[PDB]
Amino acid sequence: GELTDIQTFDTSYKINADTGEVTVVGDNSATAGQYASADGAKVLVGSDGKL
Amino acid sequence: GELTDIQTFDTSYKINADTGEVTVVGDNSATAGQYASADGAKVLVGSDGKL
């Protein structure tokens, strides 16, 4: 019954197995950047949130 | 009028020109905490650029 080519996100369905977003951590500061299409947007951990 | 043979320690006159100070880069803090003997002195950059 498992859809091989169809996955479900935390919200709905999509054909992506994993988002796999990449976050780069600044060495000189505790700030962690966003290494993706957002391209450096600051990442923060929310209440009961992964990132 | 300077001497290369005999140097002076931060608080004393030591012949050993190099001390090999050991600092640890505090992960998630981005602060080079001291490691050698001060053990967490929280090194700051001096006015001449040295640690």
In units of Å, what resolution does this entry have? 3.7
Whether residue B29 lies within 8 A of chain A, CB to CB, comes out as yes
Whether residue A5 lies within 8 A of chain B, CB to CB, comes out as no
Q: Which residue of A has its CA nearest to B28?
A: A30
Rounded Cα distance between B3 and A42, Å, is 51
Q: Which of B30, B34, B17, B41 is closest to A32 using CA atoms?
A: B30
Q: After which residues does a break in chain B occur, C–N more than 2.5 Å?
A: none
Distance from CA of B18 to the nearest CA of A (A): 26
Q: Chain A contacts of B45, Cβ < 8 Å?
A: none
Cβ–Cβ < 8 Å for A40, A47: no
Distance from CA of B29 to the nearest CA of A (A): 6
Whether residue B28 lies within 8 A of chain A, CB to CB, comes out as yes
Residues 6 or more apart whose CB falls under 8 angstroms from that of B34 comprise: B21, B22, B23, B24, B40, B41, B42, B43
